[PDB]
Amino acid sequence: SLGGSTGLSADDQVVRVEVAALSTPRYPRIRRSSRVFFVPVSRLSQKLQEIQRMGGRVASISPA
Amino acid sequence: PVTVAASRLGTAAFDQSPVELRANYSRDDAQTVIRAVYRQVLGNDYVMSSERLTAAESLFTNGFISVRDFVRAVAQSELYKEKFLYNNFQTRVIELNFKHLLGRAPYDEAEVIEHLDRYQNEGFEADINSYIDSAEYTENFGDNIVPYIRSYVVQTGHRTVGFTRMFSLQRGYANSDRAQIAGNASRLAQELARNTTSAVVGPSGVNEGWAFRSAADDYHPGQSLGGSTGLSADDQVVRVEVAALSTPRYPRIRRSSRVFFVPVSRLSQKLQEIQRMGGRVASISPAGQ
Amino acid sequence: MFDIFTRVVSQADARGEFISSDKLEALKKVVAEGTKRSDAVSRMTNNASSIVTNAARQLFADQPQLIAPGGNAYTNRRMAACLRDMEIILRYVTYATFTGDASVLNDRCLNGLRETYVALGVPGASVAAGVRAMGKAAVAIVMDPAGVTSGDCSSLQQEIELYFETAAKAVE
Amino acid sequence: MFDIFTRVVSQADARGEFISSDKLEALKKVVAEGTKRSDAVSRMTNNASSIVTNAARQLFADQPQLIAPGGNAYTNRRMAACLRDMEIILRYVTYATFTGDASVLNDRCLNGLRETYVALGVPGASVAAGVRAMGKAAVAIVMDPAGVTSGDCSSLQQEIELYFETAAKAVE
Amino acid sequence: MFDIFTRVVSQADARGEFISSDKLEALKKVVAEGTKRSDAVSRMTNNASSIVTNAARQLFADQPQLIAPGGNAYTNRRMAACLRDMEIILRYVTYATFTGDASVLNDRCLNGLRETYVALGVPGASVAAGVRAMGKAAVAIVMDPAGVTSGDCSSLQQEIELYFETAAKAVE
Amino acid sequence: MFDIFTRVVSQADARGEFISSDKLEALKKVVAEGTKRSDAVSRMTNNASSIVTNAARQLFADQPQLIAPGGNAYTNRRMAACLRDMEIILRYVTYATFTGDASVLNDRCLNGLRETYVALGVPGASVAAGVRAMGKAAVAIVMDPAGVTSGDCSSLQQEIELYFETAAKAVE
Amino acid sequence: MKTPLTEAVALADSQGRFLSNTELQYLYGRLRQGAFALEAAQTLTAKADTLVNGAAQAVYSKFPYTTSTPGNNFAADQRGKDKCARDIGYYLRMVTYCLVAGGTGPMDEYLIAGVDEINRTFDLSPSWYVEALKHIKANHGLTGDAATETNNYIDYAINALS
Amino acid sequence: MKTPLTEAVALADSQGRFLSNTELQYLYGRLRQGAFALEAAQTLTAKADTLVNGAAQAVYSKFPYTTSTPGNNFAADQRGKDKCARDIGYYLRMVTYCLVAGGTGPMDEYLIAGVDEINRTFDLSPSWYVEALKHIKANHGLTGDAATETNNYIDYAINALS
Amino acid sequence: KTPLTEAVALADSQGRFLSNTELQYLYGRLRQGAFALEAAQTLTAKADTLVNGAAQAVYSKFPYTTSTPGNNFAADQRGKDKCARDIGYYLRMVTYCLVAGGTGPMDEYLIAGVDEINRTFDLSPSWYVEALKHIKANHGLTGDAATETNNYIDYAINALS
Ligand SMILES: CCC1=C(C)/C(=C/C2=NC(=C\c3[nH]c(/C=C4\NC(=O)[C@H](C)[C@H]4CC)c(C)c3CCC(=O)O)/C(CCC(=O)O)=C2C)NC1=O
Ligand SMILES: CCC1=C(C)/C(=C/C2=NC(=C\c3[nH]c(/C=C4\NC(=O)[C@H](C)[C@H]4CC)c(C)c3CCC(=O)O)/C(CCC(=O)O)=C2C)NC1=O
Ligand SMILES: CCC1=C(C)/C(=C/C2=NC(=C\c3[nH]c(/C=C4\NC(=O)[C@H](C)[C@H]4CC)c(C)c3CCC(=O)O)/C(CCC(=O)O)=C2C)NC1=O
Ligand SMILES: CCC1=C(C)/C(=C/C2=NC(=C\c3[nH]c(/C=C4\NC(=O)[C@H](C)[C@H]4CC)c(C)c3CCC(=O)O)/C(CCC(=O)O)=C2C)NC1=O
Ligand SMILES: CCC1=C(C)/C(=C/C2=NC(=C\c3[nH]c(/C=C4\NC(=O)[C@H](C)[C@H]4CC)c(C)c3CCC(=O)O)/C(CCC(=O)O)=C2C)NC1=O
Ligand SMILES: CCC1=C(C)/C(=C/C2=NC(=C\c3[nH]c(/C=C4\NC(=O)[C@H](C)[C@H]4CC)c(C)c3CCC(=O)O)/C(CCC(=O)O)=C2C)NC1=O
Numbered sequence A: 001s002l003g004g005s006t007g008l009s010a011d012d013q014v015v016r017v018e019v020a021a022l023s024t025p026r027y028p029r030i031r032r033s034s035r036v037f038f039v040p041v042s043r044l045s046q047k048l049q050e051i052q053r054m055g056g057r058v059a060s061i062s063p064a
Numbered sequence B: 001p002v003t004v005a006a007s008r009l010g011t012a013a014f015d016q017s018p019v020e021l022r023a024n025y026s027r028d029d030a031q032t033v034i035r036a037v038y039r040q041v042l043g044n045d046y047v048m049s050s051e052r053l054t055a056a057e058s059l060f061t062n063g064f065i066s067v068r069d070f071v072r073a074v075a076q077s078e079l080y081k082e083k084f085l086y087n088n089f090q091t092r093v094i095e096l097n098f099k100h101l102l103g104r105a106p107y108d109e110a111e112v113i114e115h116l117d118r119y120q121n122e123g124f125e126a127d128i129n130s131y132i133d134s135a136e137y138t139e140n141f142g143d144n145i146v147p148y149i150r151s152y153v154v155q156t157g158h159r160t161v162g163f164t165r166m167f168s169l170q171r172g173y174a175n176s177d178r179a180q181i182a183g184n185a186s187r188l189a190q191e192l193a194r195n196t197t198s199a200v201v202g203p204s205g206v207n208e209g210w211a212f213r214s215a216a217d218d219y220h221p222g223q224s225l226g227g228s229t230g231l232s233a234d235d236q237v238v239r240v241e242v243a244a245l246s247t248p249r250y251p252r253i254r255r256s257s258r259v260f261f262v263p264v265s266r267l268s269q270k271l272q273e274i275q276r277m278g279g280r281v282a283s284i285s286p287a288g289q
Numbered sequence C, D, E, F: 001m002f003d004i005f006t007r008v009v010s011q012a013d014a015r016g017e018f019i020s021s022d023k024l025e026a027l028k029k030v031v032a033e034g035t036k037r038s039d040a041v042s043r044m045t046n047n048a049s050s051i052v053t054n055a056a057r058q059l060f061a062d063q064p065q066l067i068a069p070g071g072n073a074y075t076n077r078r079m080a081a082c083l084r085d086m087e088i089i090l091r092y093v094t095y096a097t098f099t100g101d102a103s104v105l106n107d108r109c110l111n112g113l114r115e116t117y118v119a120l121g122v123p124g125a126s127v128a129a130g131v132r133a134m135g136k137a138a139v140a141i142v143m144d145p146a147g148v149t150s151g152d153c154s155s156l157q158q159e160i161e162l163y164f165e166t167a168a169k170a171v172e
Numbered sequence G, H: 001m002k003t004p005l006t007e008a009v010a011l012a013d014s015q016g017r018f019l020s021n022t023e024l025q026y027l028y029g030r031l032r033q034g035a036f037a038l039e040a041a042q043t044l045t046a047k048a049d050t051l052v053n054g055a056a057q058a059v060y061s062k063f064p065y066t067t068s069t070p071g072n073n074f075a076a077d078q079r080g081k082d083k084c085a086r087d088i089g090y091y092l093r094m095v096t097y098c099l100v101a102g103g104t105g106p107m108d109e110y111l112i113a114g115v116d117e118i119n120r121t122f123d124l125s126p127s128w129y130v131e132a133l134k135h136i137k138a139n140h141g142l143t144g145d146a147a148t149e150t151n152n153y154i155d156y157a158i159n160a161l162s
Numbered sequence I: 001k002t003p004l005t006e007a008v009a010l011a012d013s014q015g016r017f018l019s020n021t022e023l024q025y026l027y028g029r030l031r032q033g034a035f036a037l038e039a040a041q042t043l044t045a046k047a048d049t050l051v052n053g054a055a056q057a058v059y060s061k062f063p064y065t066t067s068t069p070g071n072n073f074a075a076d077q078r079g080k081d082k083c084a085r086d087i088g089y090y091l092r093m094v095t096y097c098l099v100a101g102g103t104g105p106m107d108e109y110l111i112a113g114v115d116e117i118n119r120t121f122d123l124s125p126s127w128y129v130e131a132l133k134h135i136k137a138n139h140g141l142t143g144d145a146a147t148e149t150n151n152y153i154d155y156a157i158n159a160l161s
């Protein structure tokens, strides 16, 4: 995770959640199922609730 | 998607399909999406290179950071605070964040408590996060698409209100969002708590009565109480709004823009009188009966 | 948002006193006829889409200038937009008669129906006549029982008639 | 946004000439009393929350119709909203006396205070009386020294008095 | 958005009949002169940026109060904003003469040019005089042929003259 | 993020005891030399952009394959990208020597410098040699006094030398 | 505004569908609740004055110090006793509205939104109203489905209160 | 979190600019604060045991009932007294870190983030720690700029606590 | 860029009251101003000789701008007037930048689009660079005020190039 907290603009550390198996979750109409995201602990709860509400299974979580 | 008098409402410029960031975008395609993000989140405000934030932008051009997180990055930026959080009123800042990030006008007073309450409890940095981390956000454009105005389509979940409140929010295409007629004041915050909507006006030239703004002191409701019992005419009544009244002069006219309520039978004669004052008509909507 | 129970609650909170006994008897009458609210909402939601097509049928037999080119309902896109408008109007009527309070229909249609219709150039007269004919057809399918156990339904008839006239004077 | 230094800069740029010497002497006086700006801002930010509770205390001893049911400050949610309004009003007063210019308070409260208060139905009279009592208590805690080295503070007293009257005629 | 072909299509759809033969002869004339549309758009897009600097040159030789401090075009940021405004105005003129219809320029500049210029405090007189001088220079570079095969170009001259007067009475 | 004061705080919180007296004497030494931190940061931020051009100068005199077509720094866009990389690297060096802790530079460059440089195909050798030459030039402009009151600066020299070697073994 | 009819309407609004049969079952459940909830609200309104009076006296005996020490939250003199009894009467009236509305919405909107915040800024203790609600749920003395539905609302207020 | 050097760095990061002279003045102000803040933290660490001991005894005499009634928040037996004295020692140590860091950041991160929430779910009262901090700010007995800077931190903790 | 207003913008973004960090920020601003005002005074005293020597030094620094007839260059006397107006503008921005305590007057009034107008007018920023070098050589001050002004001047140089 380049910059650590610069582009994320929250000083707190980055959790780097990787999600797989996403299929017609909502309207975003995403191109592939498995993607890797960079989230900080300040919004990690929101994105995790979003990931599970979409229909995705997180495959790995590794602090970068 | 209007297509009848689309010229008149100014939403003809927002006709195009939204921009989509591909899985492996080129550098030029990156720059187009960056220009779209700058134009939408800052409301067609042009940017100087000293305020370009090229460092946060390069991280987006890599692809390690998503488009939606770039939207977060420009709203987290200090220039957005200086252009929008700082000069405007905080309720007006909430109003602007509804256009900039969600892409639509607020629907009620409950959203303006939730974001004011949130501002006092946790800060602007957290408030912006609450706009972007929303189901209403993530449905319409999850990660890849730029924010864009969705209010002109019903989108299965619009209340009626946001269509007409959006035209109070944005004017035209050429108009820069920092720079409007009212300036510092918030148009919608008067409208929200009374739960009322003003008449839709289009932007200038195409319509020449654009100058009309409802007075803050005088509400002037649309219906005017009884299909004109008091005006004493048998026919239905329309609301009429005039933009300027400059021919009449200072001792005759205290305020250029006023609202008249007329029956249709006397409509022609009052319109002729307005044209004799050199006044150009903003809006005319059916009022009562 | 506002239900008739919550209507009584908001009145009793604006007064700030406990609820009167006779109002509670009125609510006992309401929960006694809640099955008839269910009967009516089920009946007209069963036939709702055909009611929308029949309302557009009478509207387009009545006013051929809408189908005529240059008319507001002329184009295929605008025709689908028309059927969208009527369908969501009948949907909010079903919402209101399910809740029992017109506040849902008012607070989610009264605000911008007239506004969109004067801003677009939509003739509000055709929507008013169409929602009137749609309301007549809705009362026609609700009131007559087809294999349904008999009862009086005049209060419900008054209720959906009031809901459709609020829609009609909403669009005008 | 606008500081008194930036106020002088904006005047000198609107004129487009260099700054006058006597205005620079006034700024020398300002930086001579900047420690007293620090003294006052520190003193009233030390006691700010208790000042908010005492202002709400005198307001709710004065006007019991607000606590009374149907009143605007009646409900628990609206009561927390009241204390929110007073706290952020005193916060912007502290911002203005820290900056030295009323432009922060004006440009971030004058615009929509009256607007929200007429749109919601908030009685502006109670907020005006409350910010007046809060300003009196703020001058009371600022002016009296408790173990503080002595000096004159009449200019600061005038400054926060002006800030609270701008707040009072902001809400009215 | 609207091209002159699509203009004819929208007229023929509002009438709802097939297109008249003489209108199709007019379109045959249009496609006969499409190479001259190409000639003109290429010529003035070749010289466009120098035209913008020369227009700002005559404007700033004419009105020195804009360069003068306190003027609206005084600051470096506002000066770049001025050149931005003129460049995108000439850009939409090139869009309109490429399309052949003024609808692009109208629907993307007429709406908020006057609006931004009265809201900011921009003197619309200077932009009107500047777009007039820019239009004169544009006709000057378009009409004269430099190694170009000869022909008549009066209709194109009328077209860009009309486009620049619509811009001039847009900003006023 | 982490300052040397906050470094001492985080050590004393991980131990969970109060801070030792000798560590506080070290912090007294630090605040005694804070003006020399100011001297150095001001000096090299005065000359920073010319240092970036001179570092690119020695790099492009050294390795002409980068300018050569097919090279990684060949194109104008990639050349501006190179100067961007060096400028923000020197910027984070200035951040680190202003804070006094390398945690800012580490946590905002160590993570993805090597990663981007192997993922793009960027030769990390040239950036390592360039940041080494840039660090030598930075020590050269920091250490020599030009009209500056004299003093010892060996600890600062060691500090920025360590910062540039952490950058050099960051990119490798 | 937690009302199962309105929550069903909000759900079908978010889906954008017409009325489904799930909503018909939702209406059936609301009628089933109300068919005893109205009579329970009736006997609660009959008992309410004795309930709040015994609850205030029981909280005063539950902690003697709020009667004892002169303070601003505590009931040293009689005006604090009046404000205290006003608060428990407010609580029980919210319970009755919560019962008659079929959901926790009157409770939620009118108490639960900022109760701990005003308890923080006024230095109140929520445990006072906790033991007050415990005395109320011990004192109403009802049986049946209505009794435990009211008890469910009361311990919901207790759980959200603490 | 809240260090004026790091807040300046976060500001210049958000602007994307190099170091400006505003940051040089910010560093000057931080050195001016630290030049007495370090000695104040020294004498606080010297006094700390007597401070927390007198503060615990003063809070116990301030409310006799927490010693009196058997409860889970209160110090009926000696383990609650130990947890109580641990809490005030935690408070004073946060004050020392808050002083030595030059800002409210150690206080903010380590106390202020969820103090009222654990006071809610454990049924504690913040006024106990309020009057404890009042006894500490009465007991440290210092003079000068360092004394009032520490007092400013203490009443900041009081205001955010209540 | 004013450290008081930057502190206010920070506490606005946090949503907190005034902290003691802001009190230290005010202390630093007073410490800067206590010589910045006198430095702006002597700069305003010296300003005409400064811009005159700077214009003449740039004219001797590049003879060709006097030589060739061009639109950016000072062939005739009107270009000399516009050139001297530009350096006087620069030095006045320096004085405002000094008296404001930060780079904000410089930033807003010059740095936002200087390279863009230099691009579209075909100016060269190095002219104003060597002009500012002559100014920072010519003001002849000593002390904290001198180097604070010199810091502002080389900030303008670095952002200019
Ligand atoms: C949830 C509450 C709600 C309602 C009711 C609503 C109505 C609504 N009706 C619309 C259009 C429309 N409504 C009509 C209506 C008609 N056609 C006619 O000529 C007749 C007079 C009438 C036939 C029924 C037509 C033609 C349009 C499209 C107008 C256009 O293309 O500009 C539009 C413009 C957006 C679009 O193009 O789809 C909205 C937002 N929006 C809402 O959010
Ligand atoms: C695509 C259609 C379109 C147009 C045309 C457009 C114009 C536009 N011109 C603007 C400003 C401007 N326009 C001028 C114009 C002038 N300077 C003068 O004094 C002269 C009278 C005139 C010289 C040509 C100036 C100075 C500004 C900046 C105003 C300010 O700083 O507030 C702004 C304000 C935003 C900014 O700061 O850049 C917009 C949005 N926007 C659009 O979206
Ligand atoms: C959606 C799946 C579903 C349906 C249909 C349903 C229907 C339903 N309608 C009922 C009663 C009734 N429903 C009606 C309503 C009507 N009768 C008329 O004559 C009018 C035409 C019409 C009103 C528009 C009446 C009159 C009664 C019996 C007495 C009364 O409660 O008013 C009852 C009570 C006992 C019974 O008659 O079976 C049920 C269960 N419950 C369900 O779960
Ligand atoms: C940063 C500048 C700023 C200010 C000042 C501001 C005020 C503000 N005060 C509000 C409400 C309020 N203000 C009060 C005020 C009072 N209660 C009374 O009855 C008295 C007359 C007065 C006691 C002090 C009340 C009760 C509400 C809630 C109104 C409602 O529930 O509709 C609201 C409505 C949102 C909400 O529900 O929280 C805003 C936006 N907003 C801002 O962005
Ligand atoms: C926030 C942590 C902090 C504090 C408190 C602080 C205070 C402070 N107040 C001061 C001076 C002063 N402050 C005052 C202000 C006042 N005296 C009065 O009698 C009035 C009641 C009150 C004004 C409301 C006066 C009169 C002086 C000395 C002469 C003067 O500068 O006016 C001085 C200058 C020398 C000194 O007296 O110590 C300091 C350092 N600096 C800090 O960093
Ligand atoms: C962009 C790269 C490009 C260019 C330049 C281009 C030019 C072009 N201009 C043409 C004709 C022409 N173009 C003109 C236009 C003009 N002559 C005048 O005297 C006026 C000054 C001027 C109009 C402003 C005329 C008069 C003709 C020939 C007859 C006619 O079609 O009107 C033709 C037709 C045959 C020819 O003359 O070569 C071409 C191909 N095609 C291209 O792909």
Ligand SMILES: CCC1=C(C)/C(=C/C2=NC(=C\c3[nH]c(/C=C4\NC(=O)[C@H](C)[C@H]4CC)c(C)c3CCC(=O)O)/C(CCC(=O)O)=C2C)NC1=O
Binding pocket: A002, A003, A006, B055, B058, B059, B061, B062, F066, F071, F072, F073, F074, F078, F079, F081, F082, F083, F085, F086, F088, F089, F108, F109, F113, F116, F120, F122, F123, F124, F126, F127, F130
């Ligand atoms: C804040 C911390 C941070 C750093 C340091 C950073 C570096 C960074 N350097 C990059 C590219 C680059 N870096 C170089 C570097 C060089 N040219 C060479 O050949 C030499 C070996 C070296 C000269 C110095 C080049 C050429 C590119 C462009 C690579 C490309 O076009 O794919 C890119 C790819 C994005 C772009 O195209 O601009 C990133 C993200 N990003 C960050 O967020």
Ligand SMILES: CCC1=C(C)/C(=C/C2=NC(=C\c3[nH]c(/C=C4\NC(=O)[C@H](C)[C@H]4CC)c(C)c3CCC(=O)O)/C(CCC(=O)O)=C2C)NC1=O
Binding pocket: F032, F033, F035, F036, F038, F039, F040, F042, F142, F143, F144, F145, F148, F149, F150, F151, F152, F153, F156, H024, I144, I147, I148, I151
């Ligand atoms: C940014 C605007 C600004 C500047 C420049 C500034 C400088 C500054 N450098 C100083 C001291 C000093 N600065 C240095 C640093 C150095 N001397 C050397 O010989 C080395 C070459 C260099 C270290 C790289 C030394 C040695 C002292 C005096 C003794 C000491 O504190 O170490 C002092 C203390 C008293 C004085 O000498 O004036 C100031 C005020 N303050 C400011 O606000």
Ligand SMILES: CCC1=C(C)/C(=C/C2=NC(=C\c3[nH]c(/C=C4\NC(=O)[C@H](C)[C@H]4CC)c(C)c3CCC(=O)O)/C(CCC(=O)O)=C2C)NC1=O
Binding pocket: D060, D067, D074, D075, D076, D077, D079, G059, G066, G072, G073, G074, G075, G076, G080, G081, G083, G084, G085, G087, G088, G090, G091, G094, G110, G111, G118, G122, G124, G128
């Ligand atoms: C509809 C739901 C609802 C509730 C429950 C509510 C409570 C409520 N209780 C309050 C105060 C108070 N509450 C008490 C209560 C007590 N002290 C005691 O001795 C007793 C243990 C306790 C009785 C419960 C006291 C003494 C005050 C005033 C605090 C003081 O005087 O400063 C206040 C602050 C305004 C005021 O009275 O003066 C509110 C808003 N408001 C609401 O809208």
Ligand SMILES: CCC1=C(C)/C(=C/C2=NC(=C\c3[nH]c(/C=C4\NC(=O)[C@H](C)[C@H]4CC)c(C)c3CCC(=O)O)/C(CCC(=O)O)=C2C)NC1=O
Binding pocket: H059, H066, H072, H073, H074, H075, H076, H080, H081, H083, H084, H085, H087, H088, H090, H091, H094, H110, H111, H118, H122, H124, H128
């Ligand atoms: C670094 C800052 C920091 C603080 C201050 C802190 C406090 C803290 N105090 C706690 C409990 C507690 N706190 C008390 C305290 C008291 N009861 C009394 O008699 C006294 C009036 C009061 C002494 C202050 C008691 C008795 C418990 C345990 C509650 C119980 O036993 O169930 C707990 C719950 C975990 C536990 O001890 O068993 C925390 C987290 N934690 C932190 O990280």
Ligand SMILES: CCC1=C(C)/C(=C/C2=NC(=C\c3[nH]c(/C=C4\NC(=O)[C@H](C)[C@H]4CC)c(C)c3CCC(=O)O)/C(CCC(=O)O)=C2C)NC1=O
Binding pocket: E060, E067, E074, E075, E076, E079, I058, I065, I071, I072, I073, I074, I075, I079, I080, I082, I083, I084, I086, I087, I089, I090, I093, I109, I110, I117, I121, I123, I127
């Ligand atoms: C407050 C800060 C500020 C500055 C500095 C500023 C500069 C500035 N210099 C300009 C032009 C110019 N600048 C020059 C300058 C030069 N040619 C020479 O011989 C010399 C080397 C150089 C003297 C520096 C010339 C000759 C022009 C007019 C270009 C031409 O005549 O076409 C223009 C274009 C408008 C005009 O004068 O006619 C601006 C905006 N504006 C500002 O708002």
